[PDB]
């Protein structure tokens, strides 16, 4: 046999997203990643319709996607960590409508390995360095300087090889023109594999830690470990520098925590649940995705939860410390692979199975007869709340997607001559059987 | 001694064969292995390929091939056809006869273009008559003397050779069907062998091979062995979709 391979409909499901001014303007662009595809959309503020400008093939796996802005430039580069042993830097040319490869750095072997970097990648909020990281034993850091003609350069990478250590996340902490530094989680399977009893399996603790640059001496020094109470998935970065304090929100199961090193006494808060729900007495609760609106006025986070409920979070802060936490129920939307909270008053809710949505924000999520929650409010018992239909968000746009296509059938099952396709798709309650045909309605 | 207590752990070959789920594998030294349950599950996996013979042996790999005499390599047909070998034989005999002085004389005054052999003869061999040799599929390692081992496990009766036919008295070629061999004669006479009772003889327990002849002289099928009531010795000694490939070139 001799075959030729053609794709009719690209992959639709979304995995990663970033938002930035990827065309230099202050009209914002969104760069999402399908499976092996990089697709760029620009949401029009007039109708609220998102035009899918540029859809490109990359022939690889996008494991990690993060935009960044150089210190003071007007563009929005992309840093892509994929499954080759390379980090790649991308830009938009609207003149040619094409992604452009600025730089390219090999650091290892191909394929979705385990000790070769690329799974996690973070930047420093100002745009001075990037860190690339694996799920064991390897992380590197790249320094970025405009050249004389301001065309970006990238020097050789740094090192942080530390054996027998997982990583549940890595993120850049917002410092003000100090040495940039990064908060990773960690773990240490080491002992739990030296103990023939399985004791050390239990009794091992995540260690929310910070590595730090030293751009003067040009190395990465281990600053600040701290044994955390319980493993939590990830870390939302606190807008530091001038705005806000520094610090990380550790999104652990049932509990979201502020924490920063130095003098701060570490801040807790249990998660408020919906009331009178029908969920298993055992089932915990984790924060799935997050997105932060940081604006001229102030900042805030949104984080979402398994049953789809969104929450608002802002910082009640005194001089240098923050003092306490307020999570107040915003609304509940589809389960999200990502949220990209625009200015111009929308946010992109990248569905995880099915049609993905664009909501517009109506009220800041503040000052109504929805209750108030806090990290200072003590209790013996929990909070609760009772959800409701869409209050603070209004459903502007709805982009279709087949993800997932759980079954198919070709036939001609209308009286038409040409065949239709009968696609059994979608997950659980949001599933469906959907008819495809070659016609346009 | 601790190796000796693990040596008391060093179970019996019967211990193994009874434990294991697939007992064909279990071999001699299997037991002195640090993890025989693994080793045996592995050796009983699908599609896997066992260690060579010769790790035990004291002689190295083919120092046993040392002894014999061996005949030179035999070219592919489609390369003989293009008639290179005769060119080279002729040039060989020439230059073995010629003497040193004449050799250097030809070094200084060459016989430029003595010979020729045309292209399209070559290019058609290599690009128009090149053909798949005989290959061996996954697993069948070559070991010493393998090419000497004749071949076995064709318990089939119909398997006949042409030298077999000649040196047994039967025919070779298109008549290997219509020729019942001299053993099918006593198959019809007193039966086919009682360990190949799952073998039927052609013309004796099977029907006529294509265009066979009934008769009792030399060259026929004779009496297809039957009971007195008419039912044959076995079987029938007398004789009473859409296979299109999907992707195929025009």
């Amino acid at each position: 046999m001799f075959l030729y391979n053609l794709t009719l409909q690209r992959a639709t499901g979304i995995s990663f997203a970033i938002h930035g001014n990827f065309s230099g303007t202050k009209q914002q662009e969104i760069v999402v990643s399908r499976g092996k595809i990089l697709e760029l959309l620009r949401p029009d503020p007039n109708t609220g319709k998102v035009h899918t400008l540029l859809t490109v093939e990359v022939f690889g796996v996008i494991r990690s996607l993060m935009a960044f802005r150089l210190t003071g430039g007007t563009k929005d580069y992309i840093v892509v960590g994929s499954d080759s042993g390379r980090i790649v830097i991308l830009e938009y040319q609207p003149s040619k409508n094409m992604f452009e490869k600025i730089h390219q750095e090999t650091f290892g072997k191909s394929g979705c390995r385990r000790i070769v970097p690329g799974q996690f990648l973070a930047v420093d909020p100002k745009g001075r360095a990037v860190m690339i990281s694996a799920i064991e034993k390897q992380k590197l850091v790249y320094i970025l300087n405009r050249d004389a003609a301001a065309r970006l350069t990238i020097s050789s990478p740094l090192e942080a090889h530390k054996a027998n250590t997982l990583v549940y996340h890595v993120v850049g902490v917002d410092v003000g023109f100090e040495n940039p530094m990064f908060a990773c989680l960690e773990m240490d399977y080491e002992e739990a594999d030296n103990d023939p009893t399985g004791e050390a399996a239990a009794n091992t603790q995540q260690t929310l830690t910070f590595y730090e640059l030293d751009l003067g001496l040009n190395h990465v020094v281990r600053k600040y470990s701290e044994p955390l109470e319980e493993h939590g998935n990830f870390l939302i970065t606190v807008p530091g520098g001038s705005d806000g304090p520094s610090g990380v929100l550790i999104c652990s199961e049932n509990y979201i925590t502020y924490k920063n090193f130095g003098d701060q006494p570490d801040i807790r808060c249990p998660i408020p649940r919906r009331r009178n729900d029908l969920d298993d007495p055992e089932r915990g609760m984790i924060f799935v995705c997050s997105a932060t609106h940081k604006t001229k006025s102030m900042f805030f986070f949104l984080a979402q939860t398994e049953q789809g409920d969104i929450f608002k979070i802002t910082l009640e802060t005194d001089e240098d410390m923050v003092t306490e936490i307020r999570l107040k129920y915003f609304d509940t939307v589809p389960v999200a692979a990502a949220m990209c909270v625009l200015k111009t008053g929308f946010l992109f809710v990248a569905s995880e199975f099915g049609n993905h949505y664009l909501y517009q924000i109506a009220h800041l999520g503040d000052d109504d007869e929805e209750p108030e929650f806090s990290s200072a409010m003590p209790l013996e018992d929990t909070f609760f709340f009772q959800p409701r239909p869409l209050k603070n968000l209004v459903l502007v746009d709805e982009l279709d997607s087949l993800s997932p296509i759980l079954f198919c059938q070709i036939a001609d099952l209308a009286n038409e001559d040409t065949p239709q396709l009968y696609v059994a798709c979608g997950r659980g309650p949001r599933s469906s059987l959907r008819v495809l045909r070659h016609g346009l309605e | 001694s601790k190796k000796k207590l693990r040596r008391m752990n060093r179970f019996t070959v019967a211990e193994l064969k009874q434990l294991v789920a697939r007992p064909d594998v279990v071999e001699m030294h299997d037991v002195t292995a640090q993890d025989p349950k693994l080793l045996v599950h592995l050796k009983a996996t699908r599609n896997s390929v066992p260690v060579p013979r010769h790790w035990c042996f004291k002689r190295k790999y083919l120092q046993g091939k040392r002894g014999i005499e061996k005949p030179p390599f035999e070219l592919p047909d489609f390369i003989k056809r293009t008639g290179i070998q005769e060119m080279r034989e002729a040039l060989q005999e020439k230059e073995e006869q010629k003497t040193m002085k004449s050799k250097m004389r030809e070094k200084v005054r060459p016989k430029m273009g003595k010979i020729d052999i045309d292209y399209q003869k070559l290019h058609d061999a290599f690009f128009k008559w090149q053909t798949k040799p005989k290959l061996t599929i996954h697993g069948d390692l070559y070991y010493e003397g393998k090419e000497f081992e004749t071949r076995l496990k064709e318990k089939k009766p119909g398997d006949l050779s042409d030298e077999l036919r000649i040196s047994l008295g039967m025919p070779v070629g298109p008549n290997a069907h219509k020729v019942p061999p001299p053993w099918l004669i006593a198959m019809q006479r007193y039966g086919p062998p009682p360990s190949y009772p799952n073998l039927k003889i052609p013309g004796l327990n099977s029907p006529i091979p294509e265009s066979c002849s009934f008769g009792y002289h030399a060259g026929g099928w004779g009496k297809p062995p039957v009971d007195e009531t008419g039912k044959p010795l076995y079987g029938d000694v007398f004789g009473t979709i859409d296979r299109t490939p999907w992707g195929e070139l025009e």
Binding site: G85, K109, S155, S156, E159 | -
Partner: protein, 81 residues
Amino acid sequence: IFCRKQAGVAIGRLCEKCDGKCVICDSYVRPCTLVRICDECNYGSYQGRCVICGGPGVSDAYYCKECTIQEKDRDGCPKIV
């Protein structure tokens, strides 16, 4: 013997005796990708030398296309020190 302390962005170079071969595969053909070395085997009197001869850096060490098909070129400064 190998340096192998991990790669960088500094190109390597060849003396003229060593001119032409790949660094490991010892080829003479079809070179595809350029060689990079480590800072430590980059500094000082070792600037611009022959990874093999030690001679002066004049021609560029390269990577035989086989070495790039098998990605034996993703290990770093292979300097025989």
